Paper text:
The final resolution of the cryo-EM structure is ~3.8 Å as estimated by Fourier Shell Correlation (FSC) of 0.143. The quality of the 3.8 Å cryo-EM map allowed the unambiguous fitting of all the three quasi-equivalent [name] subunits in the T = 3 icosahedral capsid, which showed well-defined densities for their S and P domains. In all the three quasi-equivalent subunits, the P domain rests on the S domain in the resting conformation, as observed in the crystal structure. This is also evident in the cut-away view of the cryo-EM map, which shows continuous density between the S domain and the P domain. In both the crystal and solution, the capsid protein [name] assumes a resting state stabilized by an elaborate network of NTA linking the capsid subunits and the interactions between the S and P domains, as expected in a T = 3 icosahedral capsid. A novel finding is the metal ion binding at the dimeric interface of the P domain that further stabilizes the resting conformation.
All these structures showed that the capsid exhibits T = 3 icosahedral symmetry, with a diameter of ~400 Å, composed of 90 dimers of the capsid protein [name] that consists of an internal N-terminal arm (NTA) and two distinct domains separated by a flexible hinge. In the capsid architecture, the N-terminal domain ‘ties’ the [name] subunits through a network of interactions facing the interior of the capsid, the S domain forms the icosahedral shell, and the P domain protrudes from the S domain.
Author numbering:
A (entry chain A), C (entry chain A): 45 to 532
B (entry chain B): 1045 to 1530
D (entry chain C): 2045 to 2530
The structure:
């Protein structure tokens, strides 16, 4: 026995994840929108549910469309019982459920009740018990090609309010570990982020085709659930830093370095990670400073050094890496050393701007086997959109190296995702870039659960954005969302 | 006219910052506890007010003072008018107000009503209009008449419940830009957090005396409510790096560098910042690599270099610095150049492990002028309390440099504080280091809102830490809170 | 306890500042219209409020749109509580307030109540106490490109009426200093105005690009609040008149004149004004008549004289100016003199029509320092509009001087703004040019608070207007107003 | 309930400044009297309210007119709502307010209720909320015969008492909050106070016209509520001193001195003060003694030194002054140095009593720009009002300096105003000079909030006063009030 604010029961508010779009590309029978019946579909009820433990009641749902007077077609909303398969439901059969048919040209909203049916007294918030699922799908083919141009997108909005019999059961403190925390995105500006695959600051955003080359980086990969994938660290200082023992090679200036750990501990080759944490993810020659710190005397004399990834002597998985330097005598093998990255360089004997091939993965285990336990590849699926890369440039020292560098997620985003561990309600979350000076939205992008960002645009392009813009999270949408044109 | 859950109105719960302590170290007349009336006195109300815009009504507060039978003392509770300042209030002037005096040995809880005294219908949640304030003061010093070498610190609890006439007025969504986002600390363990004064991962914690030197670092300073001070900046990489234009000085290997802005622009000398963001704040010689990109052919040139922060020419504020290298050529004067530090070096002729001088601030304007806009100095304010430093080992390249480096706050903590502008309800936040696999508490530390951490210990001591330990926030306490010894 | 006319409570009238427009350029999340709850949003109530001191009640607001049947989208109106930030409000969150969603294709009006919430008994008219703010913003993206051409602008209109509980408190006389006087614009015709930067009558209006040169005049600058900026006087006779002592330079015809004041008082170089009041604002050679009036004998013999602004001998700030004349002996240094402007002349040794460069500001302090305390620069911000200049021509005497002259505001407008001192309710006021013969409006222009006029047009153009047209003030609008095309 | 003494509730007392006069020279429309409503109108209530927190209730005002049956003329009393400007009110408009018309022929007093109008339950003492005003204006001019050379002027007095609804709210300790602290002027005699612009004891008082020059002093400027203006300080021994480092100028007998703070710390030129505290604010030639605290051979130093306030090198704002001495080279750089003034001298190539022009401010910035953040200029505005200067004689070592130095406020007065930050209840305070030997009043003067004193006199005149006379504070009034001729 409990009561909520009387205003909530007498007004309609937008459901956090209740936005969807229809385009002529969508055919009848495809599922457009789906939502379980829970307190999370009403912002006030979602906020209150963090204070209580059990909901018990139905809803009233209101649908608003936005269509021009040229477009024609019908959209059917229906309620599906607690344990009923929804795969293969033809548009004819779905009418047998309680349903409403809404014309696209309908100015007014349409109402529908959602009475809760169950065999239990009440549900639990930290449980997955099936409930009535509200679905919305196309009824007749949509025809809007005549109107305007491009692909006329008709928008939808879903509002909800609680039924008079809705009530909560038990009162509990709102705790951090509740597993009900809403998903959020850091409000940091794009220019202050840190590149996840090299210690350099971000500068811009990029869009372009990805069909000409395979995208599968092992750095900057982290799902929205806070699970780290591939070979990703938290600290942006140990991105490409090696620490361990060093041995001189007589007759030349090359050195062989055996990696120990990030904490100067014994290396574990039995781990399922593809390569030791903090290894480079690109084929190229990297120039930096190697520093040896003798414990007794502090003989800290730095030396210029280079490492050429992708060569036959680069086997980080086995625990051996080759360094090329200028002095072959001024190093003592009895003390551990570390390597600090500085930049990349290009072999002048090859074509200009060719040495750094970010996409190509170097052979971590040399000639003894092919790399294993790699992060899954990333590629867009919905036609008409391209990946969004966070683009920066590393400094150069010699040759003409390729300045371009792209990372899927900034280091701050990875850190925040790891810290939050917020459960994902779907596979795709919708993010809008917002200018805080006026509040206008510049463009929309979809953040997939696998840890990448997609935006609807064709051809290479450099996004033009104000220096103070930031990303904001709005809702969870399914893969059928027709993303609005970017246009910047 | 909204309704609260009837369970809240009939039961007592503990306020977030609702515990204090009485210790023999406390002098008489000190403000032991202070709290303004409002939703913050009850966690349920402090969470429900996020959805509302106003409130009106009083409270009922119980105080639990279950002290030992061998102690003696008197504590006074008084109510302060809305507009009445309490900066220099004394016990007699406290007794002028409506007062209740209770023993430290009291067994029954002390019950106090707090009616809301106001000149309007209701208060605004987003505003800061003063209201009735409750203060608990140590009327009589605590003394113990027990045999044995023991200290009977008395821990006292405060519970609150809303009065029957408490109600909210208007309903608003719980957006970001509001009195929301209760304060929290990242759950990251010590190992992954990176240093704020230099790009080096942490390895240990330390506590020790600080009376022999002035502790006033400029990097890694941030108040707990999301304000950056001095030269603290978000990016863990741009911590001690420089970028700008380089010019060769004829007859010597030294180079004169004109500083650029953060990304590409020119530095503004009129900014209310002591130095360009990411300027080192310790006197010593820093070794690094100068990198230049030539637009003529795309070639990248990298050369070893050393910068003397203690030199006269080291004037980041004026926009001109001096670099020392070994090659006096192979550098163009019309291209942007970056400086990436690698480590710290020292002169072997000088005293070993005494040149870095981690607690000495180099002059940002050279001989002429002085440092102007600095962060406030940090020093403990309670007897028996020492600062807590996050210690890392900055690498060296020659000789025996003092590799021991200390930072007040890790870069992750300042990044989190800036990202989440959580308001502070008091001056001190209690943080307990806990072991998740065991459930015990290793030690208790106070996090001052100015951005530093204090503990109760005497003499130098290297902290012992489980690998999985992390900091957990518990309550809000004032400056006069006494900590349980390690 | 008081009563108002029963007709007001039973009818809707237009709110003085209640007009706004929506265009496809506007994106969701941007604030379109905002209005505090006060008596000033109802003309009858605004008139009555000048007679009373305290309002106390709510309103009923009605919204009318004007959209074709091709346009599609939604607009949301909401009420914001007395002390709630409105920055960053996403379109999803704003629905949590009391709200109404209006479709652009809605023929009928939509109603919404505005009940007043407050902690005081009643508000004060001469106070800034926060109240409920009504906001109106886009809900879904607007799509009208298919319909017609250009950028289809959909118009809006807001009507208001008082709630049954609205009542006034105290009765006071309507005084001039009330600080509640409505803003007004002089009804004088364009052809009888006086140029604010030279004593010549106005002749026409001009529009054109301003990106090729910097616009920052120091004359004719006066904000709508009656605060004088830069170096502006009230009397149009002392626009470029110098008065003070004169000293002959031996060996040539040049004279050095020390300015005293406009009232023949001691000069004050410690003033924060950039230059003495009434100095020229352009680089050029000015020809006029210098007259000396001896007190005892009235030796009033005029002499032709020229002054070359921008030269090294032109330092009005220090208090010294150089005059070039034809007679180097017929002047007595013991008597003060004045200079009367006549026209401008051009050096024939240079290119034709080049000497007068109105935009360029001469160095007021010669070589000793750069000019200080300048008026802020003026430049349009909303893309698609250009500044409106009041254009005239000065007479010429020698050479081929540039006849064109532009002033931002006429002298009569500056005088009226200084006299009225009417407070501004926003940063932009909307002015329509009206032909009084028939009452039709010719074009619309926006008068910014900084003291300049902007009109939507591209390319250089000379406006064609009837000789008897005059400007009229209608309302205050925000910077998001989409100005209608000028087209004349 | 918070009962007030019945004698207060059943008797009338005079308002602090509720007396005015109506003369035949007055024309219709002039505001004769104006006063806000509040506890201040009754001294008993104004002192009793210091122990309470809030008040609520109206007043009853009695008007007493001194006239006979051979005069004509009418006065109008009106009650202005709280937030309504009264400047520029036409004589016709005032009748639209609730008004009462009184004849100067009346003998009985006039009773006027004055209820409190507000939008909240009650007012706070520290809120300073606007309240209902009461204004008395001349409606119909005064027509009466004159007794020879004396013009017949009617007098009027105003008395107030609390309404039965007047009551206080909550009780607070009397002496912790300074917001309600009454204003008070020191009672030291004239011969004992100290001049503020130079460490010299005061000599006498001077009056005279000031329209021939700009009176803009920079020392001794302080508002009556305890706010310092310009470069005025507290210590009277640092009025014209310089502290800092010294460096000899080769080829001459001159020294460039770099200023330091009064604590021998660094001085920041960015401060929004016209000059470092203790900088002289008058053009002239100052002779003094220069003493340095030197190490090594000895600290015994000191020589006659001269400072040119009019020199182009005199840049106290930038931190550099020029000193002229008689020794070629005897000081060294790197030791703390102070300059002690002893007098003012003259140049033999200028007019007598022309160098120490006390009303001409030296250019604090030298020649690079103009002085900034100056103290507001002071000049009388009402007819027949002249400034009252505290005049002292300046000793001279050579030449014939203009020994007359004038100060608007002595150093003790500014020190007292800074110490006791008593808020001002109106725009001017009425001060009369009282001789305690006989109890008579020599003259009455107005003390403006800006920190200056005005008297009603015409032409130069040196005041003759008994040694024991001193100033006494009477009441706060507004500018409308007039003073009888001295």
């Amino acid at each position: 026995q409990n009561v909520i604010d009387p205003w909530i029961r007498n007004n309609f508010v937008q459901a956090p994840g209740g936005e969807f779009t229809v385009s002529p590309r969508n055919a009848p029978g495809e599922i457009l929108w789906s939502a379980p019946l829970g307190p999370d579909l009403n912002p006030y009820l979602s906020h209150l549910a963090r204070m209580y433990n059990g909901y018990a009641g139905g809803f009233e749902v209101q649908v608003i469309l936005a269509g021009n007077a040229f477009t024609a077609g019908k959209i059917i909303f229906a309620a599906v019982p607690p344990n009923f398969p929804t795969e293969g439901l033809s548009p004819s059969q779905v009418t047998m459920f309680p349903h409403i048919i809404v014309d696209v040209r309908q100015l007014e909203p349409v109402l529908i009740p959602l009475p809760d049916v169950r065999n239990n007294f009440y549900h639990y918030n930290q449980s997955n018990d099936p409930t009535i699922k509200l679905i919305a799908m196309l009824y007749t083919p949509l025809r809007a090609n005549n109107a305007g141009d491009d692909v006329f997108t008709v928008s939808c909005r879903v509002l909800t309010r609680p039924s008079p019999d809705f009530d909560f059961i038990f009162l509990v403190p709102p705790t951090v570990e509740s597993r009900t925390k809403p998903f959020t995105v850091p409000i940091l500006t794009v220019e202050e982020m840190t590149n996840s695959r090299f210690p350099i600051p971000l500068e811009k955003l990029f869009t372009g085709p990805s069909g000409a080359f395979v995208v599968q980086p092992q750095n900057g990969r982290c799902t929205t659930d806070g699970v780290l994938l591939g070979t990703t660290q938290l600290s942006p200082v140990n991105i490409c830093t090696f620490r361990g023992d060093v041995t001189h090679i007589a007759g030349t200036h090359d050195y062989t370095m055996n990696l120990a750990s990030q904490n100067w501990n014994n290396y574990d080759p039995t781990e399922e990670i593809p390569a030791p944490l903090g290894t480079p993810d690109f084929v190229g020659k990297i120039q930096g400073v190697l520093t040896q710190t003798t414990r007794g005397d502090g003989s800290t004399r730095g030396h210029k050094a280079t490492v050429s990834t992708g060569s036959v002597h680069f086997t980080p998985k086995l625990g051996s890496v080759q360094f090329t330097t200028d002095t072959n005598n001024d190093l003592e093998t009895g003390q551990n050393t570390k390597f600090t990255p500085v930049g990349v360089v290009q072999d002048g004997n090859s074509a200009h701007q060719n040495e750094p091939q970010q996409w190509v993965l170097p052979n971590y285990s040399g000639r003894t086997g092919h790399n294993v336990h790699l992060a899954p590849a990333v590629a867009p699926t919905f036609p008409g959109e391209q990946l969004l890369f966070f683009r920066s440039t590393m400094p150069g020292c010699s040759g003409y190296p390729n300045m371009n560098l792209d990372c899927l997620l900034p280091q701050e985003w990875v850190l925040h995702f790891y810290q939050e561990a917020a459960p994902a309600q779907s596979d795709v979350a919708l993010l809008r870039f917002v200018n805080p000076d006026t509040g206008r939205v510049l463009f929309e992008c979809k953040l997939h659960k696998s840890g990448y960002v997609t935006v609807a645009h064709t051809g290479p392009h450099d996004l033009v954005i104000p220096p103070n813009g930031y990303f904001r999270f709005d809702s969870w949408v399914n893969q059928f969302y027709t993303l609005a044109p970017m246009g910047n």
